[model samples]
Target chain A: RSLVIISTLDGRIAALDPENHGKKQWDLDVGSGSLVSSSLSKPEKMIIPSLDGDLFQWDRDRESMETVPFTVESLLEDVVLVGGKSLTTYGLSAYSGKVRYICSALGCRQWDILLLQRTQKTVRAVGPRSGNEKWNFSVGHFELRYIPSDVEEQEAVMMDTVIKVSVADWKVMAFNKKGGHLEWEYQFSTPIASAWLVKDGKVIPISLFDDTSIVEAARGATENSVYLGMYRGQLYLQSSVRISEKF
Target chain B: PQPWRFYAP
Candidate 1:
């Protein structure tokens, strides 16, 4: 099995020998400070973001890690998006880690750009990718949204769906993937506190003030159902079904 | 010796 471990802000990477009872193979220092963020690892590449807004990608074969010159203003996990041709990152250099290609304009002269797309009124997807305006969208102020999970299937299903929870409006809205042409909107009696995609077929949402309200979708009919939890101390269940005409 | 020139973001 392959493993990728990150050293804290103190600037250290502890390498272990697999066969030697997990003994230390080598210890490398990248810099000073605590490495408080998680790292991204693939077969050939390992990426570590630093507290100082610098990114480091390491190539295992060469036993070296180079500092990526790009800097992110806000180094949030949800802001990093990998894959696709928009951002070109490949190969390794003896001196630097891996070179990343970015759109100089949208990324503010940086190699990558942070994307904010509205899937529904209550949900949004935020990540870093190549600076391409064709794949960007925006959300209104009254919308309560959070970054969706980075899982494969869930990402595919919620590719363009925005989960909107409006406590003041007592409503939930989802902007379907087909731009803003199609909308899935729901109104609730109380305000929704949080929402998450449990799986491909179901979503779980909770109320801000109560724990008594819980909602689940019907079996096999959850193509567009939102499960709701309560604000009170107890659990409650509710479901809404709607059939729209597509012409 | 100069380090190998590699591309990075």
Candidate 2:
């Protein structure tokens, strides 16, 4: 239902339409100066962050440009507006765009949210949002990984669990969504790109490494077993069991 | 073109 555009240093624009499977819809060169940042203000209007730290609003209806009085060094890192009368200017809900929430001080180089955790590490939901600390989590700072399970299951009530990747001696963490507690952690030879929790008769945590090996962490177990690519891309095929933990 | 860089906290 929406499209996002990013400009290369050469002034070429690449458009991404989410409804179209995040495909590039169009590309155009504006001029000699490259665009620093750009977003759809609405169906017709566009807000572009420039190298000069000025925000530029493009009115598709008027076919012209207007300058907004705010400055941000990197639109990708520090600029996001939520709820308000200024909604028309930033292309957000009228109620959500009036109050601009800028993270000019947090110094985030890149920020995104994962809506669903398919594995301990692999996230299904990834998108940009206002710098609301309520929805943030460090990627590799902690040791446990928590995934929510169906409410009908009783034994899976513990929202947090431990994850051990057996390759690079790296330990990453995750937390339970219910009470917000630490889950589990382990060291690996290298960093894992993604992880998944498989539940059936027992709980199994599968971790995928950059080299594509699969590490399996059985429930209530400290040691993990290594399996060569079984999930079809240099990964292992673990059992397709049901998840038990309730977030 | 110079790489797009930023300061993070």
Candidate 3:
């Protein structure tokens, strides 16, 4: 069953069970300043950390799984992330929350407390400890994410293979992680919000409309060819009802 | 490594 969890600005985090008419299952108060959702977790891993400064990790059991102490928080479970504000960045040890380093870029954002550098031209994912890069992909114009601060990521076509998109047009591309090279692609189409590529490399755009599709960096191609036309769906609530419908 | 590397926007 899908769990519906909500973390409010007032500091209450609760899980809702849809099977039970959206009834509350469990809730905990983490003490809030603000709820910042990176959507970087599996539903159960979703927790709230406000600038209120009492950030932590929680599980089904009583004790917290971990904390953002030090080492270099790597989108971690019982790990850590430390940030200042939009102004500057502080790389803290994900182990003990010790101050590790302080760095600044004119208008760049270091993803979380790890200091993975993300800018307009390139996205450099770095190591949590040494600050060494795991991989870096050069990218062009990208789609904006739901969280305004989330522009640090590009759509991943496969693992390290990055996908970059265009906002002005329905342009999509995928890139190789080993080296920034074009490996796959879709000629062109509007796939709003989140879209996925199946085993056949077919693009499945979930909704009819959502502005923020996949962000870009890589390459890929879809279909045998391109066809331009209107996708009109027809109502198929059959007479005495059994035959469903198609577009 | 995961089947895909993911980072949030």
Candidate 4:
């Protein structure tokens, strides 16, 4: 995990923790200027705002900083704080830089995937990639945390398949990150506990209480895979890479 | 405190 340090061409700012302490460590050039008014905005996805009232957006296609027509939500004022999800997020506007939803709960630096809590029953898995949406499903009241997964499982009713998914939600839905294609969808008796992809193109889904069997994958799933289960409250799993030959 | 272009040697 690297920390982002934004600065001016003439060497304006730097946040370095030389002592390794967690507090913000800064070094100033000092002279005719000493940061008259300093504001901090370190966002993931490299969405940086310069002191010149110009904000740069991250273009994943080229992996470069490209300026947009938009400014930044008052991030250029006396002490501007600018940082958020992918240039995926433009504060709240392109030219106006009006942030739709800004969370000050934690020192949020980068946001590759943004969370927009508008409607109570909808979680839009947008990359919505540039055009096709990953998912725009309306579930129950929920807040999403893009937690990376460790493993999988399958349960009752739909023994076919199930996934805890990318966003924090119940239903099982996984998509192809590259082209955003609907890969699998199966329902569990209880809200999905958690789901993640194994070494191969396979997922594990855990249930709340009524733990079931392995939900079969779609007709064309990856060749080699593994799955871990946790029904009675203990990590019970094995590595399938070397366990079987036709894995 | 210092010169922009100092003489060599």
Worst 10 residues of 3 chain A by lDDT: A234-243
Docking model 1 quality class:
incorrect
TM-score for the first chain of model 2? Answer: 0.18
Once fitted onto the true fold, the runs of candidate 3 whose alpha carbons sit more than 4 angstroms away are A1-160, A189-193, A197-247, B1-9
Candidate 1 positional error at A152, Å? 15
Across A69-121, the per-residue lDDT of candidate 1 in tens digits comes to 54333222224332221222121111122222222223532322112111111
Best-to-worst order by DockQ is 2, 3, 1, 4
DockQ of each: 0.01, 0.07, 0.03, 0.01
Model 3 interface CAPRI class = incorrect
Fnat, model by model in order, equals 0.00, 0.00, 0.00, 0.00
Model 3, residue A58: distance off in Å is 47
Name the candidate that leads on TM-score. Answer: 1
Per-residue lDDT, model 4, residue A127, is: 38
lDDT tens digits by residue: candidate 2, A1-247: 2333222233333333323333545543323232221322324254443323344454666665455554342222233332211000111111111212212222322211111111111111123464442211111111112122555323222224333222222233334444544454433232233332323223333342221221332232123222221111111111122222333
Name the 10 consecutive residues with the lowest summed lDDT in model 2 chain A. Answer: A114-123
What value does the lDDT take at residue A54 in candidate 4? 36
Candidate 1 positional error at A198, Å: 1.5
lDDT of 3 by residue, A9-44 (tens): 222333333233435455434232222222232343
- DockQ computed for model 4 against the true two-chain complex using alpha carbons: 0.01
Per-prediction count of colliding residue pairs? 33, 43, 31, 15
